[PDB]
Amino acid sequence: LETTINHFFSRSGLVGVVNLTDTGYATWDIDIMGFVQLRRKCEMFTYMRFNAEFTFVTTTERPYMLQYMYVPPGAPKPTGRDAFQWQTATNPSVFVKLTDPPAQVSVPFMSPASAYQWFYDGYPTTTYGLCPNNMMGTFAVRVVSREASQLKLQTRVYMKLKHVRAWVPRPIRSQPYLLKNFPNYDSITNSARDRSSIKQA
Amino acid sequence: LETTINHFFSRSGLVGVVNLTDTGYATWDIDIMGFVQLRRKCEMFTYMRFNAEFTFVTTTERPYMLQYMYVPPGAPKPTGRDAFQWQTATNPSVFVKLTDPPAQVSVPFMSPASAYQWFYDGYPTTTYGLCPNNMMGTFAVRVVSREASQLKLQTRVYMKLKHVRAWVPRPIRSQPYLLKNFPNYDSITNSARDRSSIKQA
Amino acid sequence: IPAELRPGTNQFLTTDDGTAAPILPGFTPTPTIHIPGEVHSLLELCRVETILEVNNTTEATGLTRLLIPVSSQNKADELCAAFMVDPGRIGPWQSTLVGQICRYYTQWSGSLKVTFMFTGSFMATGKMLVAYSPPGSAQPANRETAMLGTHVIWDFGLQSSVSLVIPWISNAGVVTLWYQTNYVVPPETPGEAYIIAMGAAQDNFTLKICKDTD
Amino acid sequence: IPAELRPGTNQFLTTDDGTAAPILPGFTPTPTIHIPGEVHSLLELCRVETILEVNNTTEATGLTRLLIPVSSQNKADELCAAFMVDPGRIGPWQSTLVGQICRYYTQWSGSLKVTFMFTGSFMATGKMLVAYSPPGSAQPANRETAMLGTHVIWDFGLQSSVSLVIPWISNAGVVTLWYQTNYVVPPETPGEAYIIAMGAAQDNFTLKICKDTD
Amino acid sequence: IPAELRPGTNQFLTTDDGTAAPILPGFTPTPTIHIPGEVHSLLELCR
Amino acid sequence: NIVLAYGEWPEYCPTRPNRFYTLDSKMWQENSTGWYWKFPDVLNKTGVFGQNAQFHYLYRSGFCLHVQCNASKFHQGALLVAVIPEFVIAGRGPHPGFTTTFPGTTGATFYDPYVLDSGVPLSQALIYPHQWINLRTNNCATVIVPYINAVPFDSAINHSNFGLIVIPVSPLKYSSGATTAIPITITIAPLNSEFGGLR
Amino acid sequence: NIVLAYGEWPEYCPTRPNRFYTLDSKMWQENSTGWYWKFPDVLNKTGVFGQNAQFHYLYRSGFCLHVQCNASKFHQGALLVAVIPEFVIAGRGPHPGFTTTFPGTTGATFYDPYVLDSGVPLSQALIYPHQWINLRTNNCATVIVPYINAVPFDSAINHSNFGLIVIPVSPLKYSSGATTAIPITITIAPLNSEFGGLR
């Protein structure tokens, strides 16, 4: 079939759009809650478990040795393009030329708990419902040269979900939401559009 | 043999010729009834069933990340090159550089009925003989950049038919036709060219 | 060894099968445990009877749009409520669970069922004629021309709930309900009640080509 | 592992075998059912006796070019009609089903047959001499020099139809028909009739290299 | 034989498995002997 | 004798409800040019089948036909009975309309028979299951037609399954004193009808 | 009758320490709008369990519930008992605070029941293990809830496992002379508790 839960997530859609000037670098936190087409399909469930793979597509406006680092959760993020975090061998990085076909890399499942939680009701001890066990890291795109890059490049990050397993369901969201990581709704819209009367279908 | 019905359709001929300026994009409906060499070979039969594969050949007048989206039947067509339909993950799209050898993709059989119908005698309830179950979608070729493409590019779309199975036959067309999707003929030409007399072969 | 490169290699297909290289080799993930309530396919979700909005008029405004009014002064055979059987069209089914997961999956086909239940006092007694028509015609006019269809004479003193199986929709069909008798109360009893409706899909409810929502 | 790239990889061959990636993986198509009248190969199409245009003169103009006239005042041994046996050349065979599917498939070879039938009254009686010549010579002149060939003495009082098997054409051969007797009528009977012809290919009719039409 | 090139080939992954070609083929290294006190995993160190 | 359309013997695999219907006989003159009927439309508003096809909106049936013309031994001519599936009137010139495409029991007539009013030449019309009514051999013709459609069901009113054409190829000649017209009567019987759903 | 939440019968695989607790009955008027409790918080500072959940910082238990309202035969209305895991109050407008999210034994009330104070519409709330208290059929409802959490343990004070909601869908109507309010009492019993670690 194609109504199984693995096929329902198996399209590789856009997540984040990252551009860099030459500052000199550009970082990007990993989060799937960026667009409304993926949030409404992932607040469906409460507990999920999945491996992900990525793809970086680069549109200038020739090839350079730009790299894509990876930060596992806990490692410090780079502050400058010539800092000492770019050469730490514990951060797995991917060197890819521009003119080559686009990069592709997989990420395993890093949360300490058995599955990711999209709803936490408690505290870590404004700190309400912020479970720290959803951190997946950054990427920190950097063009590599000795000085004076001067590209004005823009990357795009795609994401495919694989081997996904879902637990206990929840009903869908029915209202637009203001904040990024909170269900606040600013009380009201309805669900079904009106008709004239109760009669006359 | 080579007179079987699979070999009779197994050449990959031209269907449509699409060019784009920079507007900014270019769309193209899927229809095999574009040229007379393929219409006379497909009004032969009444019911057909086949998978198709395509190929996009690009002739400028360097490489850019131009994509080829696909619209399954029912999804909305894009209106601008920076609209929100370009990032819907339910539309499968293909990123291909210019200098690479040309793209190639297969399309499965999407009609709701068991086989495609090239002749319908009825109504959906000017609406005579327009069966809506022949929709196959678009492609919506778009060059990808942040702004100011400036290419003046022209693509060509090829089509190969595979695994084809045909049912009940019909005689061939013998007159030129005026309209695109109707057999109107503007009554008259003959079929065989004349000779002098009934005698003298 | 010799090899060639067919056209179609240097491309990103956006729906692909080949795995990339893992970025952390040797990493063993944390092993799963037995969390109860695992969903294998979302077909199990659309077999859940959820509350159907019927009274979706302008002046409803709140929880009162989840319920159909039943008076005690209505004369016999006057239509109590009526709505289309259309999982996906803009109307009553837009609130239920079927109506949200069929904004995805462009082509649907199956056999929906509709369940009612009654919310009056124990002393009340009446009847209802839950009717149905095929999608050829519009709704009936009288009680008599609606009686000839697929009626289920549902009363109140015996049963508090009733179902109705609708056969073989595809990508209308109109259900109504008629009074067919007076609404009977004893004294010192409020003479108004409401009938909330349900909605679900039975086993042969299948889907086809995926599509994004709204 | 090591590998090389032989010349001929980055090319589009326009007649190829390797499948591309499917754009919708996991999609199961709608399964077929038993539609009657399935054609496996188009060799079955060219074994259908279709109406052959013979009277393709200038002044024909309509359905009257589908039929050969037979008078009642023609003196014995005068040629009624004559045409080449040439499936593909510009002439009589251009209307039949053989003559259209052999504008494709450049080289043909086989054994065509020609069938006639008669469209007079029941009281009429005559004869015909359906002759044939090999493609070495032209058509005969007299009835006698046509009689020595491959004649079939077809009459009217017994048979209403007759066939003739033409052996082994390739990429001319001329068929005629002669009167050989008077056309005999009783009184109060219209003395004109027509003979429509047919055309088909028997079992050993094979084709070769494909070619576009017109 | 036909073959395609999926995206992700011309890249350096910084955590990889495929061996490069040895630069000195045929060279046999000096064989090891029994040095006592070999550590297989560093879990033995933190005990 | 009888001609099975593609060799089916139409069975069925919604209730399962056979009178020999008789359409009204057309007169055939010298300068006549043909007729067509487009089944299963002509059985509507006629008989118990008409009360079963107008109220039900799913349909499957097969037919048995019997085209029979009665002529004396002093006439001549030859007809052509063919059964065309999904037979579409094209329209000359500009669509043909409605009372041209659905003629009812009075079967409509042709304008240009040489191209079948669809750009399809008559020389190749014998692909369809045909039967020659030659007036010096016989006077009857019988075609059995199964249900030929991609979807296993359809509506009875809108979609026509197939059509029936009758074309005078050789024109009718007759000596003076004989009757000018020759009738053509048609018999229609449903074989395995199977309706579904009531409105 | 009874409704197993997803069919578990909650066993366990840290010592292993059952009195039927009884929360204080809420009054239900005409213009009331609902309640919620957020277990296992309301058992804190109450009973021997409260002395076992305040001092221990690992926890696992399952519950057995019994929501029961007593009404005479002259009232009408229907409630809705659902058990929502990881039930999060959103906050209108702006976070909701603390005395709104952890109500204690006095279960807090709703503001907008149509969206469950989380943007989730009530039309689809029956995905959760529900049980209709319809006042012309019965007067009781019983839900057994296992321990539903990703990590096999948690603290008792901070993390709430699930919540219990009671919503008046059809409002209560009553003729004049009857009592205005109807009580709703709730019974809570731990099934297989298993604590761990003492502070």
Short mmCIF file of C-alpha atoms in Angstrom, two decimals, chain B residues 97-178:
data_model
loop_
_atom_site.label_atom_id
_atom_site.label_comp_id
_atom_site.label_asym_id
_atom_site.label_seq_id
_atom_site.Cartn_x
_atom_site.Cartn_y
_atom_site.Cartn_z
CA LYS B 97 22.77 21.02 -14.17
CA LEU B 98 23.04 22.25 -17.75
CA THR B 99 26.39 20.74 -18.73
CA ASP B 100 25.40 17.26 -17.52
CA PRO B 101 24.00 14.65 -19.92
CA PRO B 102 20.24 15.07 -20.21
CA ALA B 103 17.67 14.22 -17.57
CA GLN B 104 15.49 11.13 -17.72
CA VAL B 105 12.49 10.13 -15.62
CA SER B 106 9.64 7.61 -15.73
CA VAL B 107 5.93 8.22 -15.15
CA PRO B 108 3.56 5.45 -13.98
CA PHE B 109 -0.01 4.86 -15.17
CA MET B 110 -2.30 7.45 -13.20
CA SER B 111 -5.85 7.18 -14.88
CA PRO B 112 -8.68 6.09 -12.46
CA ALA B 113 -10.26 3.65 -15.18
CA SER B 114 -8.36 0.35 -16.05
CA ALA B 115 -6.96 1.88 -19.46
CA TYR B 116 -6.83 5.38 -21.23
CA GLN B 117 -9.93 6.10 -23.58
CA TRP B 118 -9.29 8.00 -26.79
CA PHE B 119 -13.02 8.12 -27.66
CA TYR B 120 -15.78 9.00 -25.20
CA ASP B 121 -19.42 9.32 -26.29
CA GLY B 122 -21.30 11.05 -23.50
CA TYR B 123 -21.20 13.90 -21.02
CA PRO B 124 -19.61 14.66 -17.62
CA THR B 125 -23.06 15.07 -16.02
CA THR B 126 -19.20 21.75 -25.76
CA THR B 127 -18.81 19.16 -23.01
CA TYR B 128 -19.20 16.40 -25.60
CA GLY B 129 -16.42 13.84 -25.58
CA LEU B 130 -14.10 15.38 -22.99
CA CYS B 131 -13.26 12.57 -20.59
CA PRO B 132 -11.50 14.10 -17.56
CA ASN B 133 -9.65 10.83 -16.86
CA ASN B 134 -6.84 11.55 -19.35
CA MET B 135 -5.08 14.17 -17.23
CA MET B 136 -1.41 13.40 -16.65
CA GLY B 137 -0.06 16.74 -15.39
CA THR B 138 2.58 19.35 -16.22
CA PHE B 139 6.29 19.86 -15.79
CA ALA B 140 6.85 23.62 -15.18
CA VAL B 141 10.50 24.06 -16.14
CA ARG B 142 12.24 26.66 -13.97
CA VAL B 143 15.80 27.91 -13.84
CA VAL B 144 16.90 28.25 -10.21
CA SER B 145 18.70 31.35 -9.04
CA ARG B 146 18.05 34.06 -6.50
CA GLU B 147 17.44 36.72 -9.16
CA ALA B 148 18.25 37.74 -12.74
CA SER B 149 18.62 34.48 -14.64
CA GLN B 150 19.13 35.84 -18.21
CA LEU B 151 19.63 32.66 -20.23
CA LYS B 152 17.07 32.52 -23.11
CA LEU B 153 17.00 28.73 -23.00
CA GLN B 154 14.94 26.24 -25.02
CA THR B 155 14.13 22.70 -23.94
CA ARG B 156 12.86 19.69 -25.89
CA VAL B 157 10.76 16.86 -24.46
CA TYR B 158 11.02 13.29 -25.73
CA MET B 159 8.74 10.39 -24.85
CA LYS B 160 9.04 6.61 -24.96
CA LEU B 161 6.06 4.30 -24.46
CA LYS B 162 6.62 1.05 -22.58
CA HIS B 163 4.67 -2.13 -21.70
CA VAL B 164 1.82 -1.02 -23.94
CA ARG B 165 -1.35 -3.11 -24.32
CA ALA B 166 -4.06 -2.25 -26.83
CA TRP B 167 -7.72 -3.21 -27.14
CA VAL B 168 -10.44 -2.96 -29.80
CA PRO B 169 -9.28 -1.43 -33.09
CA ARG B 170 -10.65 1.36 -35.26
CA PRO B 171 -9.83 2.36 -38.83
CA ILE B 172 -7.31 5.08 -39.51
CA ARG B 173 -8.03 8.74 -40.13
CA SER B 174 -8.10 9.64 -43.82
CA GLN B 175 -8.61 13.41 -43.79
CA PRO B 176 -6.80 16.34 -42.20
CA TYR B 177 -8.48 17.71 -39.11
CA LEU B 178 -8.98 21.31 -38.08
#
